[PDB]
Amino acid sequence: GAMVSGQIMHAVGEEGGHVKYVCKIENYDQSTQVTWYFGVRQLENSEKYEITYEDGVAILYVKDITKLDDGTYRCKVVNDYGEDSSYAELFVKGVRE
């Protein structure tokens, strides 16, 4: 392309609930691979995170929200030509001023 990774919107998470992040990719192809991060931590499918990627749409769902989950989330996109990343925040009540 490209690729270019699209803008991701911020979210407020309530304790015990969930939030989602959606990142739309321009000029994806057969070599495109997507990895999400929370702060310094690399994410994978588990009891905590529901992660999918198909046809230029990356989706991260975060479950069972706690105060620990407040911070910065990154969607990192890599192919045979280069890379791009997009970022957004999760705000939980009681964490930030």
Q: How far is CA 33 from the centre of its chain?
A: 13
Total domain count for the chain? 1
- Rounded CA-CA distance 97/79 in Å is 39
- Rounded CA-CA distance 19/80 in Å is 31
Deposited experimental method = X-ray
Resolution to 1 decimal place, in Å: 1.7
User: Using an 8 Å Cβ cutoff, are 91 and 10 in contact?
Assistant: yes
Give bridge partners of residue 51 from the DSSP assignment: 60
Assign residue 19 the CATH number of its domain.
2.60.40.10
Q: What is the DSSP letter of 69?
A: G
- Rounded CA-CA distance 45/32 in Å is 18
Tell which phi-psi region holds residue 59, choosing left (phi > 0), alpha (psi between -120 and 50) or beta.
Answer: beta
- Rounded CA-CA distance 11/17 in Å is 12
Q: Which residues 6+ apart lie within 8 Å of 29 measured at CB?
A: 1, 79, 80
Structural domain including 56 reads 1-97
User: Using an 8 Å Cβ cutoff, are 7 and 86 in contact?
Assistant: yes
